[PDB]
Structures are given as structure tokens and as C-alpha cells.
Design a protein around this nucleic acid. Sequence first.
RNA 1: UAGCCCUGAAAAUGGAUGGCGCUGGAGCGUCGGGCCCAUACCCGGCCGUCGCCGGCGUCGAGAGUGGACGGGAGCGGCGGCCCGGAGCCCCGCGGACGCUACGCCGCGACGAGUAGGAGGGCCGCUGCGGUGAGCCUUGAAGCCUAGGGCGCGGGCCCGG
RNA 2: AGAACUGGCGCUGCGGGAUGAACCGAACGCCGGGUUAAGGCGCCCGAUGCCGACGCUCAUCAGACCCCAGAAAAGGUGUU
Lengths: 51, 52, 175, 129, 187, 112
Amino acid sequence: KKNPLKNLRIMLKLNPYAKTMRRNTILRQARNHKLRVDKAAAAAAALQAKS
Amino acid sequence: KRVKENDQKKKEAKEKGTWVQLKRQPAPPREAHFVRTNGKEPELLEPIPYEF
Amino acid sequence: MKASGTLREYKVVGRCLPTPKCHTPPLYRMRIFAPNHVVAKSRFWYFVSQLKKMKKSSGEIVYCGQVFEKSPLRVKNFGIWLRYDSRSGTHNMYREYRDLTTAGAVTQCYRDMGARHRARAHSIQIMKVEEIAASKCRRPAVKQFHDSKIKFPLPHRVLRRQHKPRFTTKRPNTF
Amino acid sequence: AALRPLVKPKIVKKRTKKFIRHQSDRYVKIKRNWRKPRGIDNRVRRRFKGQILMPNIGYGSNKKTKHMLPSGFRKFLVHNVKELEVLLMCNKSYCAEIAHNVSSKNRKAIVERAAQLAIRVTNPNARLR
Amino acid sequence: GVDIRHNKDRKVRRKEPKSQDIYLRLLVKLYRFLARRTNSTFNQVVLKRLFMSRTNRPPLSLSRMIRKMKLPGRENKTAVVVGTITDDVRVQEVPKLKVCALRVTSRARSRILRAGGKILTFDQLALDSPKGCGTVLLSGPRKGREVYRHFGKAPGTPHSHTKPYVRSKGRKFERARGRRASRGYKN
Amino acid sequence: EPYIAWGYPNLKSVNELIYKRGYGKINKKRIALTDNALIARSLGKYGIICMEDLIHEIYTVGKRFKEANNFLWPFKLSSPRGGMKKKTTHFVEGGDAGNREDQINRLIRRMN
RNA sequence: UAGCCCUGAAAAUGGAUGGCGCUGGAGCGUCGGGCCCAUACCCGGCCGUCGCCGGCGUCGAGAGUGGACGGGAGCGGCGGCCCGGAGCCCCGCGGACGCUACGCCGCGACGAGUAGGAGGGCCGCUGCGGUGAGCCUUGAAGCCUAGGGCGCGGGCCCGG
RNA sequence: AGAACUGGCGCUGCGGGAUGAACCGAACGCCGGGUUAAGGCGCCCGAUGCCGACGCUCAUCAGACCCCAGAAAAGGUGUU
Ligand SMILES: [Mg+2]
């Protein structure tokens, strides 16, 4: 008994939706990560443009 | 009484076409209901001191 | 109750069930000090059953949230009322502390009742807690920190042994 | 190794220590042959700690490795040529022993029949001149 | 420990006969092939009946069989009994039924073969109907022995009807007190 | 309630239990349900023919909860790696034997 | 009033928070973060018992959870002059292991034990019928042995 | 000494209670890794060698952990 949640592709043997659930929560947490790092730079960008 | 008002209610579902589920159940957990504290605010009670 | 760790104030309201005789009972409110919310709604049915004819089977709680002090930064003076039990009889007690939060002042009670009076935390009942302002304190241990331009040094400092070499060639100054 | 016997695994054994009878150290009337103690109070049967262990079926060896010699064969003791030839289709799995009664003349002959058939004998050089 | 209770681990039935009959042991090998392989429940009944003891294989007389084959529907089936077929003196004429049994007796198979019937062993039953189709499998009165009328509550309890162990039937052998209301009591 | 600890599990509690420590019984055997065939071949009568359908009846307590539960062997969990507290008094009293109503999810992740 | 302490508080060998000791605690009360280890619990190995079974298909030609023929009518497909038709293996003559069926294989769960009860013993001793074209003065039985092993064990085998 | 109810010991080892029949955990085929229960972590003695938190207490007989192996009424301008 290889472990689901510990490797892929046993989950996908038991649950095919688990992959398309998983790259969606890699795609969207990377677009919330590109957003916030760009946003936090854009606050101190104009604050550094001031001085 | 139930066997009596059970069998007649069983053939009432034959003429009407339903799934009335005459088997009895234990008490389920209480339904997600909604209380209303209309106007007022709840009463603050606090433990009384000891006097003999 | 164990009074495990630092406590946490909860506002718990609840009401006995609507009977066919009684519709809409008035939904009482208490102020439970407990380490988590599961103990907090367990002490509500301890205190309500001593005050009204209610119990957990024929009642339910309809709120249990952490209610927290507004001013966690301002230093406040707390006076609380106690109903502990002793080994012989039971006594009422007023008792004053001085903390930045309400749940930290009642935590400072349970520790202090066990320290001075050896009273285990199941035998003591908090009646009410509120901030008092200065010049209404009666305890001279709380009163002595009401001093603008207060100052005091730290004599005879001792700490961090074995942290450094247990074996040193150096007699450690206590300043 | 004069001969190699098919697959020889790592022979594990659970114990290499030869179970002794209780109180066999203290007396010499008591042989070291195992007899289980059935007294009503003794501390070996009741199985206290730090005392003489008593054998049970958990100490049994692996089935694919049971009766394996350290050379990887399994002995089958023979008496003459006519029962050496019965081990011809087992020669990479089993090995022959010559019984201790076989005279030095006949033992010389049933080891030369063993070398033609390439069957391992465990004691080839026994009772020589 | 687990607390899953003891005595549920072991079953106390028979997995092979205790006979050393090399002709019953080949009948066993024939039918425990057919039991695990043909998927018919006739071959499971016959297989566990070959394992049974001699007391569990009571003899079946000739007129229990032909009385249990005058029934409607049984007109062309074959009678299986795992055990002997003896013959009744009580029956006068024998129908032409087809039987199949271990060890039919000598006077019985003279009366079955005069009637025109055919006796079979369990070999040529297996060639005939491997599923066991069209067979009426019979049994003898396994509680018809003299031993079972000694079993029950007690012979000296109320309404026992248990037939005690006396060494000889007659007057003065277990008939005096406890058996009549004049002498002592009556149970 | 002197001998048990229990409470109301959330969705990933049963999700972690059914996958990791989940086992099934067919007739008398404790099998690893490592295939969706093994769920369907016995309990497929009730339309709960896959793994995540089995996980749906047993969280949202559905019509066939009973036969979905009794399919499962009892969850043979490990010892709680954070340690326990006192094991003999109530969770209210400071120990842990009894109802705790959502803190069992915190306990499963140490158990499971 | 009640917490800690003290007075009240006296016994015979020399002596006991277990001991040494311990007073910014190694004491008492209330707590926190760690950390320690049972034969328990979880994963894995192996033995055994018990439970449910598997293979007589050694079927390299066996193939079947639906199956044939041969006729009444239609296709898609394979070879066109829109007419169309069973090939039985063979350039290799080949293809492991098995199943003492009382044997073999597979999965799953379990394992304390006095008195007591059953089972298995290729555990052992003496004697008999059979049987090993057994063994032996080129050395039997016995006895000895820091010799070599096997068996969980009862024990056994081998070297000197 | 004798009853009731449940468990246990007798038949039963193991961890903890220094020691132990019955107490507290916990039941046992032979092992490796993991983790815990009850209990603990100055040194014997595995683990507080944490910059642990807050108080209480000084004894010229301190005190110190279920069962459990020593004590009361009364009193103390001793401290809180
Ligand atoms: Mg005893």
C-alpha cells in the first residue's frame, strides 16, 4: 500500500480529479504570488520615486 | 396503533405515488435554526456570593 | 477546569429550548474565563444551572466567541471578586491585580490563589472583573505603582548558568 | 567452495545459543537437554526478566532457509553407491554425507562415484590411510 | 490485546474422512475436484457426506427409498444415498427405480436388478450428471439408533421418557421407588 | 466516555483517514483499498462506486452511511506523537477522555 | 479568617523523602515549552495457529462472463476489368518450474496461561513381522571429545 | 469476622510506585524502526545543561507525590 497524499499517481489511480485540482492550486497560488510581490514593490517604488 | 395507521398510510402512497418512509427514526441532531434577539440585549448574570 | 496556560475571555449566550408552554426564552449571557472554547461552553452550563433551572439537555448555547479587551497596550488596574472554597468552609473575596488585559489579570488570579491560598482551580468561582481607575485601589501592593516619575534599580542579578561554560575561570559579578 | 549450490540466501537464525535446561549449571545430574519447568512457583515458567529463556514457535527459522548448511546445501546421508545415485537430480540443492559406519574401503569408492556425478560430499577426506 | 473473543477462530468439522479406505479416498478426490470447480451445490452436499462417520451415515432401507420416490415429480430421477441400501422384508414388489450408493447389500441388489432397475456407484454418477442434475438425494434415519432413545433430560425427571440403563429388563430392576406412587413417589 | 476521545471531524480529517489509514472488509479480510475496483465490486450496489464517493457518504452523512461505514475496518491509528494529557479525566477537566467537538482534528493529525 | 511554618510531639541495635544531598528550590501551590522509555500502539521481516480459499487446463495451443453453422437480404473492408474469397500454423518441429493431491499455492486476522483436555512428533528406549541385493575385523555397540553442523525444541548427524 | 456490585489476584509476565500478590498504566509468538501511556527528567539513573512563568515558606525534629507505611484538639504581635 503505497501512500496517497505522499506520492502522486496513486491518488490519480483512485481519484483522477486530484491532478486537475492540484495544478489549479499551483496556478492560482503562483498568480497570487506574482501579484503580491509586484504590489509590495509598487508601494515602495513611488515612495522611493519621492526621495 | 402504528401497524394500523402504518398499513393504511402505506397504500396511501400507492394511489398518490410517493416514498413516505414510514420507518421510524431516533432523534436526529437539531436543525440549523435561527434565534432572534429582537430589540433587547442579552441578560448579564453572574454568580451570587456566599452567605450562610 | 485546569486553567491550562494563559486564559482567554469568552462571551457565551444561550437559552433553554422553546417548550410548548414557553416560546422565546430570554437568552441569558455570561462572561466565561476558560483556556479554550470547549471548556468555555462547559462552564456556562455549570454556572447557569446554579442560577436558573436550565441544563445542557433542555438548553443550547447560541453564541461562543472570544471577547477581547480593547486596549491591549494600556496598563489597567483590575479588581475581581472571588468565591473560593477552603478546607474548612467557603469565603467571598475581593482581590486586585494590574495587567494589560482582562484574561491576563484573571490568569494572574488563578496562579495567585494557588500560591497563597492553595486553592485548586475547580473550587474558585469568578464573580465579576472590571478595570478600576486609580485612587480607588485599596491594596497597597497595587497602589505603590501609581507614581509618576517612578524609578528603581535592579539589584543582585542572577541567570544563565550552564548556558555558558559551566566551567569558567571567572567569578560572575552580580552587578 | 568445491561446488556451488544454486541460490544461497542470507541465512538468518533468530538465535545461535542452544537452549539449556533450568538449573543445569548448578548440578551435573541434570543434563543440559531442554525440559520445560512445570513447577508452580519457579521464575522461568512464569517468565520473569533477566533469566533463562524458554523455546517457543516464534524462534522458528525461515522456511526457505531451514536445514541450510553454512555452505548452502542440505545434507542427505548415504551408505553406498546405490543410494548415492538417487541424489543425481538434486546435486545443486542437496549434499551427501557418508554414514559413520562405512568402512574406509567402501568410503573410498562412493566418493569417486560422487566426483563423477558432481555431488557435494561434506566429508570427503574421512578415514583415509 | 484486542478483546476480539476466543473460540471463534476454530471450527470443528471434517476436512477429510478418518477412513483409510483407498476406494473412499479416491471418491473424495473425485468430488473435491467437482465441489470447488463445477459450481453446483449437489456436489457440496455429497462431498461433506463422504467425510461423515458411520453413525452419520445411517443405512437407508429399500422401502424408505421407494416410498420417498412414489411422490409426484420423482418419476425419473435417480436416488443418491451416501451409505448402504439394505432391503425391507416388509415390501412385496419393487418398482424399477434407479439408485446410486456406496455399498448396496447382496439381497437388496438382487431385488433392484430383478425389478429392471440400474444400480450405480459414485463414479458413473459423476460421468452421468456432473452437476448432479435430476437426482433425489436421500438419507436414512440418523436418529433411528438405539442410542438416541437414551438421551434427553434424565430418566428420573418429570416426564423424562429417557429409558434408563438397566442391565436386564424385568421385575425389580429399577421399578420400585420413583416409579410408582405407592413406593416413595413418582417423578 | 471514560474510555474514548471523540468530536466532530472536518473534511480533510476524513480525507486523510480514508486514504492513509483506510482499510476495507469484503467478507472477513482486512484489505488495502488501493483500487476503485475494490470499492465497487462489493459496495457498488448503492451507487457509491468510487473512492471519493465513499468519502462523500461518510462525511455528509447520507442514506447509505451504515453500509459505507461497516465496509471500513476500524481505523488502526498510531500513538499520538505529541503526547496526551492525563488520559483519565475529561477534556473539560484537563485530561482528554471525552467530547472535545473540534479539537479531535488536532488530535487526529498527531494520531494519524 | 486560612495558607506555609512552629509549639503541642516521648521508646528501646545505628538509620532512612529510596540514598547522597537540596534553601534565587533538587521544597510547597498553580502552570508552559521540551524531553525520557513498556513486551502497549503504528509500519516492516519471520515462525505458527486459525479462517476463506486456489490449481487434475502439463491446455506452446489452451483460451470460453454467451456459442456455432448454411442457407433469405445488406454493408465497411481486403485482390476491379463494377463480376470476386477460409488459409488446416509453419524459414526455426521448438517452449523453464509444477501436483508425496495426506502434496502445493495465496490472502487476511491473531498468539499470556496453573489445574485440566486434545493434536502433531522425520523425538527417544527395548522387542516382532516385513523391508533396505543396508552396514560392518580395511573395525560394530559403548564411552570420550576447546572438532563441524542441523533442529524453536524433544534431539540428531558428521570428524578425531 | 461476614454480605452486595464490578474488576483483579490465584493461573500473569512487562513499564511506573526504591523495595512489594492485589495499586496506576498495560496484558506476552521472535525482531528492526517510530511513538506514547502511567511515571518522570540535581547526581546515582535514560531525560529540564529551559537565560521556564508567578507567588508561598526558614524549621536548634524543615519539607517532599494515589493505595502507603506516622499523628489530633488547642495555640502563635512568625510571616502572607
Ligand atoms: Mg504462585
